[PDB]
Amino acid sequence: AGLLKKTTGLVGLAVCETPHERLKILYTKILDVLGQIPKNAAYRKYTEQITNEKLGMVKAEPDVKKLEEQLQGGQIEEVILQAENELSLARKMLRWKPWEPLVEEPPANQWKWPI
Amino acid sequence: WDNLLAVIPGGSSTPLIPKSVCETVLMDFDALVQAQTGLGTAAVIVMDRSTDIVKAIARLIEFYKHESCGQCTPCREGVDWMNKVMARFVKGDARPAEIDSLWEISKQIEGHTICALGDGAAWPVQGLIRHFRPELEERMQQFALQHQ
Amino acid sequence: ASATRVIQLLRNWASGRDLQAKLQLRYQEISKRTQPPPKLPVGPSHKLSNNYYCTRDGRREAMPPSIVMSSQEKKAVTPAPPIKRWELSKDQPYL
Numbered sequence: 001a002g003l004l005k006k007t008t009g010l011v012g013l014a015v016c017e018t019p020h021e022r023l024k025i026l027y028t029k030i031l032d033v034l035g036q037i038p039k040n041a042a043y044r045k046y047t048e049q050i051t052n053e054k055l056g057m058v059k060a061e062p063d064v065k066k067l068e069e070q071l072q073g074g075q076i077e078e079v080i081l082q083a084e085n086e087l088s089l090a091r092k093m094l095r096w097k098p099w100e101p102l103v104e105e106p107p108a109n110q111w112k113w114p115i
Numbered sequence: 116w117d118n119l120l121a122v123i124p125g126g127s128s129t130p131l132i133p134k135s136v137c138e139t140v141l142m143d144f145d146a147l148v149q150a151q152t153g154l155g156t157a158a159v160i161v162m163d164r165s166t167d168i169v170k171a172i173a174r175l176i177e178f179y180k181h182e183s184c185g186q187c188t189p190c191r192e193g194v195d196w197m198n199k200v201m202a203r204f205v206k207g208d209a210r211p212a213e214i215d216s217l218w219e220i221s222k223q224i225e226g227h228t229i230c231a232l233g234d235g236a237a238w239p240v241q242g243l244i245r246h247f248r249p250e251l252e253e254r255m256q257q258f259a260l261q262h263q
Numbered sequence: 264a265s266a267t268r269v270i271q272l273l274r275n276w277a278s279g280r281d282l283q284a285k286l287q288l289r290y291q292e293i294s295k296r297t298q299p300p301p302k303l304p305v306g307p308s309h310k311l312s313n314n315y316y317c318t319r320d321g322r323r324e325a326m327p328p329s330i331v332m333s334s335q336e337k338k339a340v341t342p343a344p345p346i347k348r349w350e351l352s353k354d355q356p357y358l
């Protein structure tokens with residue numbers, strides 16, 4: 001927390017003045033969109049393993065200055081940006097649906113370099 | 116017993132034994148084997164302090180070079196290589212690491228030959244290396260000292 | 264060097280610094296071009312004692328890519344620990 005940081009050190013990236021709850025209502029959203037995905041999905045178990053877990057201290061600890069080393073994710077103003085891509089990514093494999101078997105096995109021994 | 120420096124136990128191929136180990140051992144196949152040598156043909160050769168062990172097997176290893184049929188390369192090449200490097204050892208023209216180098220090639224031609232002469236050559240020099248090691252170091256020390 | 268103290272003063276004042284301390288050219292400080300013969304060292308494995316190439320087989324010791332999964336509770340990991348935010352240079356933090 002403390003005095004609002006004038007600049008985050010990355011041009012284009014802006015300092016958000018309400019970062020803790022922005023992480024909160026983002027982090028709920030991936031948990032929300034994860035609801036559609038099946039339980040057997042490998043994505044979901046990994047998602048919930050780091051979503052509400054990392055929703056933990058941000059819910060508990062409110063000082064973003066201490067929150068830097070809570071997630072080892074760098075500056076908070078890009079962590080919420082990173083959470084945005086995770087929310088974005090969750091939408092992506094809501095369509096890819098990758099837990100089916102391979103579309104096609106690799107044709108003959110194409111791999112196995114050298115030739 | 117004071118005079119004798121070492122004794123060829125049972126044959127030229129069998130590594131020579133010094134007084135330090137041959138003070139009690141019985142001349143039998145089993146005791147000779149555990150004495151890092153062999154009874155072989157019971158060709159016991161006595162030799163005193165006055166003679167040099169290096170000049171002793173010098174003529175011995177020279178005879179081995181004069182015999183090898185040359186069929187397999189380890190005996191054909193190594194034994195002559197042994198003769199040249201050991202000829203330097205007589206005067207002492209080698210650094211301390213050459214004894215390990217001589218030991219290395221001695222293990223190289225040991226067993227790798229078609230016949231047992233190749234190892235039959237390894238054993239005498241191998242026994243000389245393991246027993247009169249300080250003698251080789253001081254003989255080489257005199258070589259560099261007198262030819263400084 | 265040649266240059267008299269008068270215009271040396273002109274260079275020093277106009278540039279705001281003393282240039283006679285170090286100049287962009289060279290002088291007698293350069294090592295002369297007839298350096299004595301060297302005695303370059305020998306290799307670490309140049310010993311004639313145990314030196315078998317069966318030990319150092321850099322080309323040979325390489326192994327195929329290790330098979331771990333092929334087409335033919337759990338925990339979440341990362342390819343490496345996340346980076347550490349390095350601190351400012353103690354010598355000079357802010358230019």
Ligand code: SF4
Pocket residue numbers: 182183184185186187188189190191228229230231232233234
């Ligand atoms: S070890 Fe035997 S086969 Fe080989 S070169 Fe010597 S005598 Fe010939």
